[PDB]
Structure 1
Amino acid sequence: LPRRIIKETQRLLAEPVPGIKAEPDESNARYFHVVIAGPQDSPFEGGTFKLELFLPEEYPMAAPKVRFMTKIYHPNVDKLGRICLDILKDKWSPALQIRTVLLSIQALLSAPNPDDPLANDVAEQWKTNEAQAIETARAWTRLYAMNN
């Protein structure tokens, strides 16, 4: 396994991102099981959100692949779990790291970006019905991100 990946993994386990649990799969070190605590003060507070992160063979020349597994009511996460994040699409650089992605996704939960050309019937609801959308994200949190 590429030396850089080993080093990033060791550093993520040694010094983890607060509110973020991220560990490599026991059978494949390019596969990371991720868990992000819902940001304090955000409509996702109290919830635990699961994601899967994959390091393609070209990493770090190619961006990591990330899929949001836990059902969430957010403008930048579609039903297929795809995440709309610039550094995962057009702004990736070999200088960016897994930590960068993790921190960036965590921030996305605190600062939703409804400035999407669609993002389904969730983006517009967040802008032209913010109060309701937020309460819906809150309900989804208790319904799907509270374990059980």
Structure 2
Amino acid sequence: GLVPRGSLLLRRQLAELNKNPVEGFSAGLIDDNDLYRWEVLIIGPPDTLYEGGVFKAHLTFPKDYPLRPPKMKFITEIWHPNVDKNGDVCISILHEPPEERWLPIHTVETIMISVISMLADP
């Protein structure tokens, strides 16, 4: 058994998230065997286009995380300028070159903060 290096980081994040649940989203593994493939459930914010909505996105971490950012893709249909027709999310926190670029220090919380903000202002 060879453990991917970022496993400890990802496990800590998952646990930190589970012990500090947040309003408006839940994050977990699609498959407990696999720390690199997450799903995030996101509640559409009040007084927006998305109010009443609930959305599933996949957050997929590269095997060399945290040096490279995860990729995010909405699975539930959604309309947003930063979300392409495949569902892929185009957001600067997830672009390689503080929250306007990927830095190895960004956590899932940092990413979701940015995603929630972009929905609260389409």
TM-score class, shorter-chain normalisation, is 0.7 to 0.9
Q: Percent identity?
A: 37
Residue in 2 that maps onto 1:7: 12
CA separation in 1, counterparts of 2:32 and 2:12? 16
Q: Name segments (4+ residues, structure 1) moved above 2 Å.
A: none
Give the conservation status (yes or no) of the 8 Å contact 1:17–1:99.
Answer: no
- Deviation of residue 41 (structure 1)? 0.9
What residue is the counterpart of 1:122 in the other structure?
A: none
Secondary structure of the 1:66 match is strand
Matches of 1:17 and 1:65 in 2, distance apart? 21
Q: Is 1:18 the equivalent of 2:23?
A: yes
Structure 1 CA distance, aligned partners of 2:43 and 2:112? 12
SS of residue in 2 equivalent to 1:106: helix
* Cα separation, 1, equivalents of 2:35 and 2:103: 21
1:29 maps onto 2:35 in alignment:
yes
Between Structure 1 and Structure 2, how many residues are aligned?
Answer: 112
Higher helix residue share:
1
If asked which structure has higher relative contact order (CA below 8 Å, sep 6+), I would say 1
Structure 1 partner of 2:118: 108
User: Which of 57, 68, 84 is the matching residue for 1:78?
Assistant: 84
- TM-score with structure 2 setting the length: 0.86
Give the match for residue 75 of structure 2.
Answer: 69
2:102 counterpart SS class: coil
Aligned amino acid, residue 20 of structure 2: E
> 1:71 offset after TM fit, Å?
0.9
3-state SS of 2:66 partner: coil
Cα distance in 1 between the residues matched to 2:36 and 2:110: 16
Structure 2: runs of 5 or more not aligned: none
Any gaps of 5 or more consecutive residues in structure 1?
113-148
Report how far residue 26 of structure 1 moved. Answer: 2.0
What residue in structure 2 maps to residue 95 of structure 1?
Answer: 105
When Rg is computed on C-alpha atoms for both structures, the one with the higher figure is 1
Whether the 8 Å CA contact 2:71–2:89 is kept in 1: the answer is no
